[PDB]
Amino acid sequence: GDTRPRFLEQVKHECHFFNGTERVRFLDRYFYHQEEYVRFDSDVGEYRAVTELGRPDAEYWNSQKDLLEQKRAAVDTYCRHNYGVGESFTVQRRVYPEVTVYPAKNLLVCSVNGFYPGSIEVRWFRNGQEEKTGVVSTGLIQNGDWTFQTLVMLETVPRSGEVYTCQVEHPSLTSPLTVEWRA
Amino acid sequence: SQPDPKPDELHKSSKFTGLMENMKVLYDDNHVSAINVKSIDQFLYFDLIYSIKDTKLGNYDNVRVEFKNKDLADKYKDKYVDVFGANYYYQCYFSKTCMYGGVTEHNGNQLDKYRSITVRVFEDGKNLLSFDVQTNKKKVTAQELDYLTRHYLVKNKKLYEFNNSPYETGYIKFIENENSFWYDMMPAPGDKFDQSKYLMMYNDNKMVDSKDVKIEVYLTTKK
Amino acid sequence: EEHVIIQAEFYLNPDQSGEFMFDFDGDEIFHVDMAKKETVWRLEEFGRFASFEAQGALANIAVDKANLEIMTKRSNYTPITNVPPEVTVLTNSPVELREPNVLICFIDKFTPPVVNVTWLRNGKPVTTGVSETVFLPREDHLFRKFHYLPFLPSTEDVYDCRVEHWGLDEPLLKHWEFD
Amino acid sequence: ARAXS
């Protein structure tokens, strides 16, 4: 459509948590288009110019004491505070997946659907034994609705009287999910 | 046009716990007012920014006017307009003071003498006070009229005292032959009052003809 | 298991539009509606367990604009290089006839965060039953967006997700049908 | 939620 130049300013305040809140890290990042020009890292304590465009802001911001204090407290006042408020339904959110096995579209496909979080382990079994052979997976698709999806198929020429299994481990389940489909 | 209200639709002053001064200040003396001004900039696509110089007390210099959508911001963008409305400072942000609507085309929208709009005040279904408010614009915003009426009422009727209001529920309605709309003149239940959100009702830049509009204020004293 | 919460925002000139949103591990918790000054939760339930003073976000956007001014001038008006989107359309689950599903249009890896998306069923529009996400940030600082269309599969119907972006030199139609 | 430019 247009061609009239666009100017984009991006800002990102990141809270990285490790083992719950045992190790919080705050990043205050500013970008010009896709370019990060300056950033504050909690494990560093001050502003660092990421590119020469940020040199001016870093030298000035880092001289303000009230502002620095505030960014330094952020891991507590901001990161930890917010974690405790949303953990109730973000970190602890769990939706079991719906597993489906169908011949294919000879590929025996295994479709694990509508689950959350991301942690997932899907294995295929040839008559009881695992198959790390010819297993193409479509990574881990994100649906944009706090739901994930992934397809993992088995490349094979099925014989008669042979059980094929798809095991699915997932935080939302106590026992592993299993879908057996022989032939 | 709009349905007349029913007793339970209106908020009751006796439910608002917070300080009432916060509504009071939106309607006594200080308010935004500029004759023949022009948008100098914008913050977001649904607002126009004006450079309204003040030497009365000078609580601000730059005013942000927000509208319901982009159509309106574009209508009045590069035009000389008359500005008038209730402003707030609390959470006004832009890159002083903020307001909604209140703009009006300048040229043509004038007349040398002031017209008088009648205001019959009904305290508990009874007409105990009738008065006039003036305006020199062919087409006025409901907001300018609303402010004028209430400003009169807080000084002569104590509409909004510092703590609460000598009235339970209250509402101002405008009448124009076919059409007739009203606004809930009382704060919503709560320990606090969000001036920004309340003033947002004036964001559709509603206008009326200064020759046909009649105003009516209905109040119910707390019994 | 590392977890990450990010407060993402942006301001775009000359469109004069911005965004303010919270992200948890790549998903949107909510974003702020600048015009209504209300906080729109990605999921209805989220508002039951939390809240956010939606208006404070304007302060951030107001400064982000201020800085774009400064920043756009220190670089001597170097505009942004467009990056057309990679569009994909897959089903929300395995497809079965007369069995209700949801079509999704994954628009990803692109900038600026401006785009026109239209769903077409049998070559014509569908302005009902559709929803969409705002622009989600990417690890590389580009964006992704989701558009959705609830539907009843059938050989009888064919669909197109049409996308217009400035990086493209012509609208894009990613197809989806039942073979 | 508390907000942190």
Structure tokens at C35: 């015009």
Please indicate whether, in this complex, the C-beta atoms of D3 and C9 are within 8 angstroms of each other.
Answer: no
Q: What was the experiment behind these coordinates?
A: X-ray
Rg (CA), chain D: 6
Query: What are the contacts of C42-46 at 24+ separation with CB within 8 A?
Result: C42/A145, C42/A146, C42/C133, C43/A145, C43/A146, C45/A89, C46/A89
Q: Write the Ramachandran bin of A154: left for phi over 0, alpha for psi from -120 to 50, otherwise beta.
A: beta
- Residues C62, C146: one domain? no
Phi, psi at C153, each rounded to 5°: -55, 150
Which of C28, C49, C79 is the last residue before a domain boundary? C79
Chains meeting A at 3+ CB pairs closer than 8 A?
C, D
Q: How far apart are CA A67 and CA A100, in angstroms?
A: 54
Contacts of C8 (CB under 8 A, 6+ apart): A10, A11, A12, C19, C20, C21, C22, C23, C137
Contact check, Cβ <8 Å, C12/A9: yes
Amino acid at the residue A156: T
Do residue C149 and residue C176 come from a single domain?
Answer: yes
Alpha-carbon gap, residue D3 to C176, rounded angstroms: 41
The verdict on whether residue A81 carries a ligand-binding annotation is yes
CB atoms within 10 A of CB B55: 5
Distance (Å, whole) CA A88 – CA C49: 8
Distance CA C15, CA C64 (A): 14
Residue A180 bridge partners (DSSP): A165
Contacts of B6 (CB under 8 A, 6+ apart): none
**Closest Cα partner for B206 from B157, B133, B143, B160?**
B143
- Last residue of one domain, picked from the residues C79, C104, C122: C79
Structure token pair of residue C121: 């069923």
Which tokens go with A126?
């040839």
Which residues have CB under 8 Å from B171's CB, separation 6+? Answer: B5, B10, B182, B183, B184, B185, B186, B217, B218, B219
Nearest partner of C13 among B67, B91, A10, B97, judged by Cα: A10
Q: How far is D4 from chain A (nearest CA, A)?
A: 7
Encoding tokens for residue C136? 């989600």
Domain end: C79, C103, C119, which one? Answer: C79
| Cα–Cα nearest to B154, from B139, B138, B166 | B166
Give the residue numbers spanning the domain of C52.
Answer: 1-79
Residues C8-25 as b or e (16 or more Cβ within 10 Å = b): bbbbbbebbbbbbbbbbb
Give C61-76 as a DSSP string: HHHHHHHHHHHHHHTT
Q: Which residues pair with C8 in a beta bridge?
A: A12, C21
Domain tally, chain C: 2
CB C161 within 8 A of CB C119: yes
Exposure class string for A14-39: b at 16+ Cβ within 10 A, else e: bbbbeeebeebbbbbbbbbbebbbbb
Residues C32 and C57 in one domain: yes
Chain C: give the shortest CA distance to residue D2, in Å: 7
Same domain for C74 and C85, yes or no, is no
- Chain A residues within an 8 Å CB radius of C141: 10, 31, 34, 36
Please name each of the domains of chain A with its CATH number. 1-91 (3.10.320.10), 92-183 (2.60.40.10)
Each domain of chain B, given as residue ranges in start order, spans: 1-30+113-216, 31-106
The phi and psi torsions of A145 (rounded to 5 degrees) equal: -125, 35
A100-A105-A109-A115 Cα dihedral, nearest 10 degrees: -50
Judge if C84 and C163 occupy the same domain: yes
Three-state secondary structure of chain B: CCCCCCHHHCCCHHHECCCCHHHHHHHCCCCEEEEEEECCECCCCCEEEEECCCCCCCCCCEEEEECCCHHHHHHCCCCEEEEEECCECCCCCCCCEEEECCEEECCCCEEEEEEEEEEEEEECCEEEEEEEEEEEECEEEHHHHHHHHHHHHHHHCCCCCCCCCCEEEEEEEEEECCEEEEEECCCCCECCCCHHHHHHHHHHCCEEECCCCEEEEEEEECC
CA B198 to chain centre: 10
Nearest to C120 by CA among C177, C166, C169, C170: C177
Consecutive H or E run containing A64: none
Q: Give the Cα separation of C147 and C54 in Å (integer).
A: 24
> Taken in order C61, C67, C69, C75, is the CA torsion positive or negative?
negative
- Tell me the residue type at C3: H
Contact between residue C132 and residue C117 where contact means Cβ atoms under 8 Å apart: yes
> Residue C132 and residue C118: Cα distance in Å, rounded?
11
What gap in Å lies between CA C10 and CA C8, rounded to an integer? 7
Burial class (CB in 10 A: 0-12, 13-18, 19+), B6: exposed
Neighbours of A118 (CB within 10 A): 15
Q: Measured between alpha carbons, how far is A94 from A120 in angstroms, rounded to an integer?
A: 12
Could you tell me how many residues make up chain D? 5
* Residue B121 C-beta-side C-alpha neighbours within 13 Å: 20
Asked whether residue C100 falls in the same domain as residue C147, the answer is: yes
Written as six digits, the tokens of A60 are 């000035």
Contact A27, A45 (CB under 8 A): no
Residues C19, C65, single domain; the answer is: yes
Spell out a b/e string for B67-84, using b for 16 or more CB atoms within 10 Å of the CB, else e: bbebebbeebeeeebbbb
A57 is known to lie in a ligand binding site: yes
CB C61, CB C91: distance < 8 Å: no
Query: Residue B194 contacts by C-beta under 8 Å, 6 or more apart in sequence?
Result: none
> CA C126, CA D3: separation in Å to the nearest integer?
38
Q: How far is CA B195 from the centre of its chain?
A: 12
User: D 1-5 residues with CB below 8 A of A?
Assistant: 1-2, 4-5
Query: What Cα–Cα distance (Å) separates residue B109 from each residue in B38, B50, B100?
Result: 16, 20, 20
- CB–CB of D5 and C22 under 8 A? no
Hey, are the CB atoms on C79 and A16 less than 8 Å from each other?
no
For residue C149, how many other CB atoms are within 10 A of its CB? 23
Selected residue of C9, C12, C16 to mutate for chain B interface (largest B Cβ count, 10 A): C16
Residue A89 CB neighbours (<10 A): 17
The angle formed by the CA atoms of residues B194, B198 and B202, to the nearest 5 degrees, is 150
Tally Cβ neighbours within 10 Å of residue B108.
Answer: 8
* Residues in CB range of B200: below 8 A, 6 or more apart: B66, B100, C37
* Touch between chain B and chain A: 3 or more Cβ pairs under 8 Å: no
| Residue A127 three-state SS | coil
- Beta strand pairing status for C27-33 and C38-41? antiparallel
Please give the DSSP secondary-structure letter assigned to residue C35.
T
CATH assignment, B1-30+113-216: 3.10.20.120
Torsion, Cα A70 B195 C60 C116, to 10 degrees, reads: 150
D2 to chain C: closest CA residue: C52
A93 labeled part of a ligand binding site: yes
- Name the pairing type of β-strands A47-49 and A35-41: antiparallel
Handedness of CA A166, A170, A173, A176 (dihedral sign): positive
Q: In Å, how far are B12, B17, B183 from B165, measured between CA atoms? A: 10, 11, 17
Alpha carbons A31 and A7: distance in angstroms, whole number: 11
CB A106 within 8 A of CB A158: yes
CA A138 vs CA A122, A149, C125: distances in Å: 12, 9, 31
Amino acid at A148: F
Count CB-CB contacts under 10 A for residue A82: 23
Chain A contacts of C170, Cβ < 8 Å? none
- Fold of the CATH domain B31-106: OB fold (Dihydrolipoamide Acetyltransferase, E2P) (2.40.50)
CB contact under 8 A, D1 and C64: no
Question: In Å, what is the CA distance from A44 to each residue of A28, A40, A51, B29, D3?
Answer: 12, 8, 17, 52, 22
DSSP tag of C96:
B
Q: Dig out the tokens for B48 from the structure.
A: 């126009």
CATH of the domain at C123: 2.60.40.10
Tokens 């956010």 locate to C52
The angle at the Cα of A170, spanning A165 to A176, to the nearest 5 degrees, equals 45
Adjacent-strand bridge partners of B219: B123, B170
